[PDB]
Design a binder for this molecule. Structure first.
Ligand code: CA
Lengths: 198, 190
């Protein structure tokens, strides 16, 4: 029956693809991608799968030509060291994600999720196009609600969680924890604590 | 101290835009129409920018998709492109001039419906303008997707975007949409 595929299809079309990227800089015409994580959640931000957490090999030239902040940032992170000794091609990494997201999402219906992802999509559109061809053109920006919280709910902004990490996969988990804080505190309450709300 | 409160009050103004390309192939597509507008933090419009139509080389206009051909052909917009005398470089200045007197430099974000795609062409074709803007954005298409999943009943009350033929009136729908999500999806305080 289609009514079952509809319920199943309409439920997967509400899932999100959560990514966290690290790059050599902000200039898309010269900078590249060096670390990418992926992860799938449902409409209520519950982990349905954990994608890989990869480090992409990039030539020593670009890393040696990175900005002070960038060359300093990724140095203490040790990520710069791993990039050189990495053996993961971009498309080899691009495909590894594409297979993961294909076995978990319908093609062209799920949106990109994550914190400040208008830049991640900007890079994935250029460098991982087959990946983006699977995803909806829209994004779920955890920072968009951070701004709307900053102006509309400054009181509860002070209680927002604090930073914490080691892998982009963890920066995803914090970004959901960030977004989950917004649903508990600034959106309309659906649940009293002991009835539910009208 | 009181000035730092008003300084914060200005740091929370938004910069609203909406563009119309010949296509989404950023490496081979250009901007064709643009409007701009400013609001305070609580979505009240403070100043409306211009609404300009950018002349673009003719071979590309008949090389854009049948969607872009028929739709912009039906909008009357592609006709105004040839009859436009505004280039990209002067258009950027007019928009850069407008916003500089209303918003603090680099403290205000882009806002609108899927502006992540409007910013992609602004990061490339209007960098002097984008320098005045914060790197963060405010996409109403993000809380729309959040409204579907979490508040689907109230999501059905969503108004129809009035199919505006001018990008400045398109924004009026986006704000009216965003104001909706605030009223019926965000927690009220008293
Ligand atoms: Ca638009």
């Amino acid at each position: 029956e289609g009514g079952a595929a509809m319920a199943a299809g309409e439920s997967m079309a509400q899932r999100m693809v959560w990514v966290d990227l690290e790059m050599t800089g902000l200039d898309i015409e010269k900078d590249q991608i060096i670390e990418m994580a992926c992860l799938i959640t449902d409409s209520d931000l519950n982990i349905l799968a954990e994608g890989p957490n990869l480090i992409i090999k990039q030539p020593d030239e670009l890393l040696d030509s990175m900005s002070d902040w960038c060359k300093e940032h990724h140095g203490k992170s040790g990520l710069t060291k791993a990039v050189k000794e990495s053996t993961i091609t971009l498309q080899q990494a691009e495909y590894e994600f594409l297979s993961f997201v294909r076995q978990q999402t319908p093609p062209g219906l799920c949106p990109l999720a994550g914190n400040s992802v208008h830049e991640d999509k900007k890079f994935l559109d250029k460098y991982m196009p087959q990946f983006m061809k699977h995803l909806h053109y829209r994004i779920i920006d955890v920072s968009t609600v951070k701004e709307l919280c900053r102006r509309w709910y400054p009181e509860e902004y002070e209680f927002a969680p604090k930073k914490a990490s080691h892998r982009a996969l963890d920066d995803i988990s914090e970004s959901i924890k960030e977004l989950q804080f917004y649903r508990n505190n600034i959106f309309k309450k659906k649940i009293d604590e002991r009835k539910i709300i009208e």
